[PDB]
């Protein structure tokens, strides 16, 4: 292989590896914030579904 093919193939590898390395670091930051604040799709633990609640008038009034 000529020096140019190896040279410019190397840059293609470096760009791919650098992009992945950046995304790896961002993911650890997103995971840290999502777990600390619980305001994202991850670390979202279920809560009772409000649609299980009965809203019709009950036998007694005060409720």
């Amino acid at each position: 292989d000529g020096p140019e093919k190896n040279y410019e193939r190397t840059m293609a590898i470096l760009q791919i590896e650098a992009e992945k390395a950046e995304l790896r670091l961002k993911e650890l930051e997103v995971r840290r914030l999502m777990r600390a604040r619980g305001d994202g799709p991850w670390f979202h633990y279920p809560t009772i579904d409000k649609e299980l609640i009965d809203h019709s008038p009950k036998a007694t009034p005060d409720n």
């Binding site: 008038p57 009034p61 005060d62 409720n63």
Partner: protein
């Protein structure tokens, strides 16, 4: 937490219906027909407010 607002003892004085349960049972059917209007308004207030202090009148 705040103080629970309560009506005064004078806000609760009314002439009570001092008859026994067998008397009410006997008159119940005619009572339900004749006194439906104020009775149903009170129970509407009662299931809407969900608070006995809001339906005293």
């Amino acid at each position: 937490p705040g103080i629970v607002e309560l009506p005064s003892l004078e806000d609760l004085k009314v002439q009570e219906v001092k008859v026994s349960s067998s008397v009410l049972k006997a008159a119940a059917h005619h009572y339900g027909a004749q006194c439906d209007k104020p009775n149903k308004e009170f129970m509407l207030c009662r299931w809407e407010e969900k608070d006995p202090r809001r339906c005293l009148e």
